[PDB]
Amino acid sequence: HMRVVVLNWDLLEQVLELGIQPVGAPELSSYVQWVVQPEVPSSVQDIGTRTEPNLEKIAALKPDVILAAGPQQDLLATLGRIAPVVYLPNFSEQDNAAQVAISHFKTLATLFGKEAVAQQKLEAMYARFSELKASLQHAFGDTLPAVVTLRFANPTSVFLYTENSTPQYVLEQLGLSSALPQPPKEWGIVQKRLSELQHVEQGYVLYFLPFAEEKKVQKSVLWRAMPFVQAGRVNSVRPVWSYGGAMSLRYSAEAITESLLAVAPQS
């Protein structure tokens, strides 16, 4: 067990799930609102933001390894001057986010000697996927409805999750199909006008919390006139980080299932 400084939320999730408490992590108070789980221990110090971390505080913590991701790639050489850096990037244009998250989860387990716990959590995850899938095809029957997932950029713009995203993986693993399929992008997202969601005659629309202007959207004319809105096939999803690690796939699956089991028809 070494002294680990983590520089991204996905990596922060990974080490925590492995039972590795980092001495340094970014934006912890914001982590509470956007990622929620796994819970960051109070012992962990905040070392700044993911894009602009406090190098002096990182050095003062005297880590043994520094874990960096895509957004930190321009600081890799400098971070290396402080401590050895393990660079595990994800959510690139050509990355399949969920598979890469799973692969990184394993490699980190190998590095920190937590392979057994990693296997146990992945096994439980794949089993959990099947349970949730069954819960859906019991409330929806077969076949399962088409689902589109997104976050709000603003009350008139939307981030649709694409083919290489982690919610897409969750949907496929849940037996769900895509209502509005999208080509692979960076971070697994493409930005759309809100009016584009009119093309979702088919089934359900799920949007991830938090969103500060949720109430404003719900009252807007463009939203109240949506096919999925008038049909009641729309719901909010409790905060699950759509740019996280291996276990974020499990959390997403449960939260999505939960929101989708609600607003489901009377069987």
List residues binding a copy of itself (CB under 8 A): 29, 32-33, 36, 39, 41-43, 98-99, 102, 122-123, 126-127, 130, 169, 172-173
User: Whole-number minimum distance, CB 14 to a copy of itself, in Å?
Assistant: 17
Residue 9 lies near Cl ion (rule: CB under 5 A): yes
Residue 40 or 158 having the CB closest to a copy of itself: 40
User: Whole-number minimum distance, CB 173 to a copy of itself, in Å?
Assistant: 4
The partner in contact with residue 9, picked from Cl ion, a copy of itself, none with C-beta cut-offs of 5 to 8 angstroms by kind, is Cl ion
User: Whole-number minimum distance, CB 12 to Cl ion, in Å?
Assistant: 8
User: Whole-number minimum distance, CB 96 to a copy of itself, in Å?
Assistant: 9
Residue type, 89: P
The partner in contact with residue 43, picked from Cl ion, a copy of itself, none with C-beta cut-offs of 5 to 8 angstroms by kind, is a copy of itself
The answer to whether 5 touches 23, Cβ cutoff 8 Å, is yes
How crowded is residue 151: how many other Cβ atoms within 10 Å of its Cβ? 17
Cα(6)–Cα(126) distance, integer angstroms: 27
User: Whole-number minimum distance, CB 247 to Cl ion, in Å?
Assistant: 14
Q: What angle do CA 214, 217, 221 make, to 5 degrees?
A: 160
Cα(142)–Cα(134) distance, integer angstroms: 10
The partner in contact with residue 169, picked from a copy of itself, Cl ion, none with C-beta cut-offs of 5 to 8 angstroms by kind, is a copy of itself
Secondary structure in 3-state letters for the chain: CCCEEECCHHHHHHHHHCCCCCCEECCHHHHHHHCCCCCCCCCCEECECCCCECHHHHHHCCCCEEEECHHHCCCHHHHHCCCCEEECCCCCCCCCHHHHHHHHHHHHHHHCCCHHHHHHHHHHHHHHHHHHHHHHHHHCCCCCCEEEEEEEEECCEEEEECCCCHHHHHHHHCCCEECCCCCCCHHHEEEEEHHHHHHCCCCEEEEECCCCCHHHHHHCHHHHCCHHHHCCCEEEECCCCCCCCCHHHHHHHHHHHHHHHCCCCCC
Instruction: Find residue 67's DSSP bridge partners.
Output: 6, 86
Between 132 and 171, how does the x/- string for binding to Cl ion read (CB under 5 A)? ----------------------------------------
Residue 52 or 131 having the CB closest to Cl ion: 52
Stretch that binds Cl ion, among 5-13, 101-109, 216-224, 255-263 (CB under 5 A): 5-13
Q: How many residues bind Cl ion (CB under 5 A)?
A: 3
Between 110 and 129, how does the x/- string for binding to Cl ion read (CB under 5 A)? --------------------
Select the residue whose beta carbon is closest to Cl ion and give its number.
9
User: Whole-number minimum distance, CB 77 to a copy of itself, in Å?
Assistant: 30
Token pair recorded at residue 50: 């993911």
| Segment 205 to 244, residues that bind Cl ion, using CB under 5 A | 243
The partner in contact with residue 232, picked from Cl ion, a copy of itself, none with C-beta cut-offs of 5 to 8 angstroms by kind, is none
Residue 9 or 223 having the CB closest to Cl ion: 9
Binding site for Cl ion (CB under 5 A): 8-9, 243
